[PDB]
Chain length 114, copies 3
C-alpha cells in the first residue's frame, strides 16, 4: 500500500515519528506487512479547501485489493483521526482518494506484482 | 472536486488570488458548491514537456461525476485559459488528467461520500 | 505519456541530464513521439518505504494505451534500472503506479485527445 498526504500545515508542525505511525497503522488496517507500506508526507503546500486556506489535506491511498465501501470508511476514520490528532487538521477539510490497483499495474523490483 | 497543478513556473509568478480564482471557476464549471472545491498549486518543479524545460504544467481534476467527453473538453478550455493568462503557460504544454471517482472511493470527514 | 518520480534522495544527487534521459528512454519504451513525453522529478521528500527512510521512490506512469502486463514489466525494469544507476535507489524500494488513460480523460491544448 502507498499513502500520500499533501498539506498546507508547516513542516515544523509534523511531529517526530509521524511516518512510522502511519506505516504501523496502515499495516494494521490493511492487513499487509509493514515492509510493503510506503508513506509520503508533503507539508507547506499552497492549497485551499472550500476556498479557505485553513489547515487541510489532500491524500491518496493506493492498494492492490483491500479497497471497498466498508474498508474505505474504516480507513477514512483512521486517517482523519491521525491527521486531526497529529497535524490538527479538521476531518471535514480532508479528502482521501482510494485506488484499487491491479497487480499488473504496480511496478516494483524491476517487474510488477502480477 | 479536487484540482492540482504542478508546474516549473516560479512561485513568484503565481499571482495573488490564483487559488481563489480556480476555486470560483471550478465551482461554476462543475456545478458544485465552492465549499467542496479543493485546489493545490505546486510551483518551482523540476519538469520537462516534450524534452523542453519551457513553462509547462501537469494537472489533475478529480470529481465524483461531472466527468465526460464534452465536459472534459470544456474543463480543458477553461483551465488551459487560466494557466495561459495567469501563469503564461502555453496550452500545448499542459496535460490535465481527469478522474471520475466513485463516491465510495473518496474519503472525507471520517467516512466516505458513499 | 507522463512520468512522475517522488523521492527522498536530495536534489544535489539528481544528475544533470536526468530529465532528458527519462524523456528519451520513455519515448523509446512506449513508442510514443518524444514531444508527447512529460517528466517530473521531486527530490528531498519526506517519505518511508517499509518503515525505512533509506533511499526510495514512489512513481507513476500515465499513458493513453501502451499499458499492460508485459509492457509494465518492461517499463519497471527500465525505470528501476535508471533510478538505481542515477539516483542509487534499490529497485526493491521503488513503487510505480501505471495508469491506462482514456483519451477523453486527458486534457491538452484547450481540449482532450478524444
Ligand atoms: O504493496 C502494495 O500493496 N499490495 C499488496 C498485495 C496484497 C495481496 C496481493 O495478492 C497482492 F498482489 C499485493 C501496493 C504498493 C503500491 C501501491 C498499490 C499497493
Ligand atoms: O468532492 C468531490 O467532488 N464530488 C462531488 C460530488 C458531486 C455529486 C455527487 O453525486 C457526488 F457523489 C459527489 C471529490 C473530492 C475528492 C476528489 C474527487 C472529487
Amino acid at each position: 500500500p502507498m499513502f500520500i498526504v499533501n498539506t498546507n500545515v508547516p513542516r515544523a508542525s509534523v511531529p517526530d515519528g509521524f511516518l512510522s505511525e502511519l506505516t504501523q497503522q496502515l499495516a494494521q488496517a490493511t492487513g499487509k506487512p509493514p515492509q510493503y507500506i510506503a508513506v509520503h508526507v508533503v507539508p507547506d503546500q499552497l492549497m485551499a479547501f472550500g476556498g479557505s486556506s485553513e489547515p487541510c489535506a489532500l491524500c491518496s491511498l493506493h492498494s492492490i485489493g483491500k479497497i471497498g465501501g466498508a474498508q474505505n470508511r474504516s480507513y477514512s476514520k483512521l486517517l482523519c483521526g491521525l491527521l486531526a490528532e497529529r497535524l490538527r487538521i479538521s476531518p471535514d477539510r480532508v479528502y482521501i482518494n482510494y485506488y484499487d490497483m491491479n497487480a499488473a499495474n504496480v511496478g516494483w523490483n524491476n517487474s510488477t506484482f502480477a
